[PDB]
Design a protein around this nucleic acid. Structure first.
Lengths: 108, 105, 58, 46
RNA sequence: ACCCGGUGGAUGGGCCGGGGGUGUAAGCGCCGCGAGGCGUUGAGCCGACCGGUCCCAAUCGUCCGAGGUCUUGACC
RNA sequence: GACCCGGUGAAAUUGAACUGGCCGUGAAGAUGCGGCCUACCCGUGGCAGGACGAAAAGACCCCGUGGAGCUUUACUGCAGC
RNA sequence: CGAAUGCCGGCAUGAGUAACGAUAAAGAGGGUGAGAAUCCCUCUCGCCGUAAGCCCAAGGGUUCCUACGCAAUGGUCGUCA
RNA sequence: ACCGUGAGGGAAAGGUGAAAAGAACCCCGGGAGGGGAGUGAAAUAGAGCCUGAAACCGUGGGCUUACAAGCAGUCACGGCC
RNA sequence: GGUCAAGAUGGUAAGGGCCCACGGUGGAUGCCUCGGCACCCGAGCCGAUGAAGGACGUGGCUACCUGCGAUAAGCCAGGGG
């Protein structure tokens, strides 16, 4: 079995998560179509993650189509500390929260 | 309002130019209702009808164009001169269901 | 002017429940008309162009 | 809303400035003060 | 979420017939130097209201969803 | 605008919390003490009543042989006359 | 050392609700891109117009052009700056 | 560095390795970043890269969850692991 | 065997509470140092032969750090080497 992982990703830990929660413990192909026509952002990002994962997979970890995702999870990490208007006095930041993307490709 | 018209305007126009176009779900559907009835007067054919449809799209090239041009092609039916067909994609950031519509041919 | 701003931390737990009610559901999709691939129920695609009419490209 | 910062070259340079600072007791004084006391540069230099 | 339709359709829009609303159109036409007036005309143009007809668009597809728990008793 | 969509994605207050009405009670105006009565698990659009809600270690008060401005035939002094 | 509305620094809260900085509007067509509502040409249209004019200066001070390029700044994008 | 007009205030940021031998080439990709291969004593030592714990977010499992109060719990007993 | 009357137990979890495994995050920690700090001895004026202190400056190839400054990382002469 082999996987897909990317840090320094600039995205919604959460939303990202719904993405994966859904293409989930399911068929490679199938979910692939899931990232394909599914809405919201990340969709892309995620589908990328998959691509690299299965490529990684039969290329050097090896039975293409019997593969699906055996687990998938995202973990938030380094932040993007955003400096916004002072309390028209004291700054107020908001953190874009870098996101860690990990997914498992395993045959049937 | 000023706007509702505005739209119905530019759109109705370009539309006749093309016979089909890309707007969004609704955009399309009503652009349909009206560009359509315009079409119907195009049929009517004459001083008056010509007058009206121009009254809105404003311009000869097309005015007559529609009028003498396709009005024929359709002169026969009962409306429906338009066929709006849902699209398969959504404009970004947005998520909006765009669509494509045309004059039935 | 913050008349009312939460009075208590929010409960890890519950908080999350709140979030809970919220469920993702992949677009219903159906296989093609004949451009044979999976598609957005009801529509042409960078696979198709059909439906019954050749409107699309590639 | 006429803040206060509007920098008037003429002026700023003028009202403060090396020369000026030397000009007086105080001036020169805190001038060396800093000099040694911390490095930096000086007013008009700015 | 609720309710009725999903081309063995009238569901939406279109068209169409009707009302109902504006008040006699765009044109030529005639009386007055002009202004206009009267005619062709109660015309013209019409947003939801009542109800036709498959002009247009509800294609085609997919999911999930039962089997009949244990014991007593009453009957066939 | 709000509401639903997709993109973006803060903030004070905050022990903690799976936090009902009651009648009573305790420091004496109780979600968590007593007896009782309703009461399923989650949520979003809302309505303000309670959580003595937030904001600020009362500026109205009194207390520290606390401070600073002004007043006259308060004390003492300095100025200038 | 809970424990000094503690100092330092991370890290969660409400919360994926609140906001996008003037209700002077947009829409279509094609072009380029890995990808464009958010760039380029182009045709409908709206808003100034005593200004949303061009000018002198004040202040700032390379911000300008030109080829490249986008990680952060650009309150979404963004092959545009 | 930076708020200050100014006089003045005044951070934070050290460590990979024995020495780079710092990562050819191949692999998805706009790329970063992820997979292989080579160093190798290890690279879950890999370039802000020693030892890198807590807070806190995740991903799999055991058990546990819809007539029910409470932070808490803890004393009893039972079911399942 | 079928029907009906009645009776009691259970499986179904959106999220969830506790228990574990494996990352993330965050940098505490121990240890480490080219840095302070502190006592004690040595030392004790610089300046127009424009000092202390900066200004704009060379490097073949450039911000910065340095060292000179126009005879710009340097020129001469003597000791070490």
């Amino acid at each position: 079995e082999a996987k897909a992982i990317a840090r320094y990703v600039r995205i919604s830990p959460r939303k990202v998560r719904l993405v994966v929660d859904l293409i989930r413990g399911k068929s490679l192909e199938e979910a692939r179509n899931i990232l394909r026509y599914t809405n919201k952002r990340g969709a892309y990002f995620v589908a990328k993650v998959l691509e690299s994962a299965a490529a990684n997979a039969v290329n050097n970890h090896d039975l293409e189509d019997r593969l699906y995702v055996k687990a998938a999870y995202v973990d938030e990490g380094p932040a993007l500390k955003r400096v916004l208007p002072r309390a028209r006095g004291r700054a107020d930041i908001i953190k874009k929260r870098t996101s860690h993307i990990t997914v498992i490709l395993g045959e049937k | 309002s000023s706007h509702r018209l505005a739209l119905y305007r530019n759109q109705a126009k370009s539309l006749l130019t093309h016979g089909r176009i890309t707007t969004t779900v609704p955009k399309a559907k009503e652009l349909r209702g009206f560009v359509d009835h315009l079409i119907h007067l195009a049929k009517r054919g004459d001083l008056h009808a010509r007058r009206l449809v121009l009254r809105d799209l404003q311009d000869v090239k097309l005015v007559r164009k529609l009028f003498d041009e396709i009005a024929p092609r359709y002169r026969d039916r009962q409306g429906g001169y338009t066929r709006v067909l849902k699209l398969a994609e959504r404009r970004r950031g947005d998520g909006a269901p765009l669509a494509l519509v045309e004059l039935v041919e | 002017a913050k008349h009312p701003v939460p009075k208590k931390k929010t409960s890890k737990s519950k908080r999350d429940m709140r979030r809970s009610h919220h469920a993702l559901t992949a677009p219903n999709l159906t296989e093609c008309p004949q451009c044979h691939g999976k598609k957005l129920s009801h529509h042409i695609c960078p696979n198709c162009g059909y439906y019954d009419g050749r409107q699309v490209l590639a | 809303m006429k803040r206060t910062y509007q920098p008037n070259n003429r002026k700023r340079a003028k009202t403060h400035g090396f020369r000026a600072r030397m000009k007086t007791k105080s001036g020169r004084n805190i001038l060396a003060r800093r000099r040694a006391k911390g490095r930096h540069q000086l007013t008009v230099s700015d």
